[PDB]
Amino acid sequence: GTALDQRPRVVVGQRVRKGDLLADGPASENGFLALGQNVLVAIMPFDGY
Amino acid sequence: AEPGIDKLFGMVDSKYRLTVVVAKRAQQLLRHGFKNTVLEPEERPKMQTLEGLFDDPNAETWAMKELLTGRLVFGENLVPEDRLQKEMERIYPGE
Amino acid sequence: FGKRKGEGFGVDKREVEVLRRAEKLGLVTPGKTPEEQLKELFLQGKVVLYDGRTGEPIEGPIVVGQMFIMKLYHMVEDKMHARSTGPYSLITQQPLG
Amino acid sequence: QKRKLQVGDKLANRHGNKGVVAKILPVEDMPHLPDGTPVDVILNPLGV
Amino acid sequence: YYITQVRKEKKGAGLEFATPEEALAAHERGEVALNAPIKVAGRETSVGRLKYVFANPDEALLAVAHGIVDLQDVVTVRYMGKRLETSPGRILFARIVAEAVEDEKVAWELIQLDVPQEKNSLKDLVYQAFLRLGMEKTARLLDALKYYGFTFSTTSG
Amino acid sequence: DEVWDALEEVIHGKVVLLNRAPTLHRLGIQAFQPVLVEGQSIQLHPLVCEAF
Amino acid sequence: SKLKAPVFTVRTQGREYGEFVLEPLERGFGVTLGNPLRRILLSSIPGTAVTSVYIEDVLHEFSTIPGVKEDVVEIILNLKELVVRFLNPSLQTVTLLLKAEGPKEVKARDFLPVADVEIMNPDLHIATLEEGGRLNMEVRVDRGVGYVPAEKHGIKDRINAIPVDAVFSPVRRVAFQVEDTRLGQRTDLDKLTLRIWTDGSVTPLEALNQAVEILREHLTYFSNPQAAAVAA
Amino acid sequence: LKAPVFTVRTQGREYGEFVLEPLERGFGVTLGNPLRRILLSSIPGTAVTSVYIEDVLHEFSTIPGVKEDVVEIILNLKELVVRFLNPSLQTVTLLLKAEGPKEVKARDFLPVADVEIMNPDLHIATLEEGGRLNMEVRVDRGVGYVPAEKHGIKDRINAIPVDAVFSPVRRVAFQVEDTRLGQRTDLDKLTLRIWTDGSVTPLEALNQAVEILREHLTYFSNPQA
Predict the structure, then answer these.
(1) CATH architecture of the domain covering E1-156
(2) Coil vs helix vs strand at G117
């Protein structure tokens, strides 16, 4: 089911290096494995929730 | 839990008896009208936007309530099963 | 914190009141300036936290930070059904949809 | 369909903290640092 | 559990009150000085028991609400005709229970507030409550416990 | 909205039965008074996370 | 949202306890009102209580008394339970007198009458006297708010006198919940119910109204600008 | 009897520190928390409600000449912060239309009478050559958080409703510091700090909040049953 689009990460008239990335995969963030997020967690109990 | 349940297990020899009594009471409570009841006068079940559980939401709760009084009678073979239904339909209209 | 002081702001009476319980609990080392105590408490992973709904502080410091956490294939679409009535299989008369 | 994080969903960290989203608090009444910055998520310590 | 708990600290000096009356007032000068903390072995009492003494419980936790005393601290308090060396926490627990079930006097009887609360103590409580008081009251008791448990849980941090 | 109010009216004091997967003793199923809630999952009283 | 103008409903029995319910309220407003209303109720409500006591022949707070069953402390305790009420602002305080002898049960009504001071609390048990049971005492009652320990206020009457913990606040307890109520399609709606325990000085409702008044009042304070800005 | 010094500081349209002192012990929280919680929610404002793009028929499209997928764009759009200068205005349709090699910013919208884009350097989207972008966004005034799911707004049937985050409050922090003033030490000096997108100013919002609260105290007017 999951959507796998590629997004482009480069601009018109930008030089580039061999092996540099051009577009990000399904779950990639600037060419790093991006499977979820970084959220701000507090780690305490809550009123039974 | 539900209103005064310990008092109702106290009322019978078998836990399950209570269930049968309540069930059958709510049954006739519905079948032969709803004015079957022994308690309406003043302060009986009620609900909340008008107020009327004084007509017909939940029947078995009515049963438990009546039963909580010593008003009803429960017993193994009180009355011949046929003349029972005869008498019920004859005394109360509401079809 | 360094910013906090220059911006115009020292300690919250709440911050103090939780540092009380902090040293009584053995997390900060008594005799020290709240600044240095808060540094201590920070390094151990924990910081003061206020309840959202009361604004009173939480009577004990609390670890917080950035955590990587993900959303799994198990959303609640594939998951919630509720049948009243409908179709029934032809040989066996137990239902389907 | 765009599937936002409804209650009943599943979230888990890399270290194997299976959990369900069970309550969505409004920003207003959930634990915030001294400076008005609130936290985003609230994990039970009892899970550790 | 967090609420039904007591501290101890630094009786660095053998603060013996058990005998001396020079140990009531002066050991408290020492307390209000830099010396003897509010809950420490003064054998027969901890200074905290000398210092604060409550008539109501209602009062006790007025005091506690004003940040004079914590729930895990050790005070003297007057419940049901007895001057009790107790934590406000413990007395509150006692109240929670006593409230859930109308009959305060039993509620007192069947709880052990001379110690903290671990799952076993609670288990035994719920059993006993069932036994002596009955089903749906135990129901209400149970929800009550669950409530305060959760609430104190979160704020305790 | 009024439809909803009627549903509420229907529910009154009826109960529904709740079961959890591997039903090993009878407390694997218990009945509860239903309560309309926002969202899309069933909500359970923590005390009987023991039984199920 | 507006027509949803909430229903302030009340169950008030006597002057000591009251349940006040107010629904329906927007998301999480129950706490927004209930929490700061309670903070007011418990501190900043205006009342009276015993602040210091002088006993004839008693010097220390612990000393037991011959002719008297109860120890000093339990008596001062009974004073901490005492509720009087002044009848006009001008009585900043009142030093109240009670002397009685021989085997009697000493009640608060035994306190010799003063013009403007009512004792809402006549039957309160103060102390029990024995044969040879002389007692004599001056108990100072002051105006104030909240709870103030013997230490923080330290009141000087006679050099033999002993300060008392000050139970000013007529409120005995406040407690409250915000539970969900529904309104049609919408279940998440906030229903505020709270409960107020008073020493009888003032009815729960009065307490409340004073407290909300205090809040509104404080809100009027945001109206006298001054200028600054900060950075380094 | 105190009569608190209300000192007001202000930095542009975004940040404002509001100091009230000296206050009755523990009133820092009693005031500086319901007001926080109100400021965060029931404060009203403006946000993009729905978008429509020439050749796009749904949010999952991509336009030719345009790096950003139409989702990237509606997300870049939610960032739009727009002052109405006249509180009769419940809504405004902004029009963008640009071509060629350009980095479309929020300033690139056509000016509309009584509206102020606060966010001019906002990076709408990135056209290369023969890139064509043309659209009508609909900003609305409203209150709190309202998904596209709930409100379902379309002027035309190639629109895409967008999630509305109205509250122009970014963060709210109270602060409660000991002020020894004159006689007693345990007084509170409460100074709460407000961060705003500029649509309203901190001050404006603080006052709207106090009003909401007072008005809410007015609901304890007449008892009943």
Answers:
(1) Orthogonal Bundle (1.10)
(2) strand
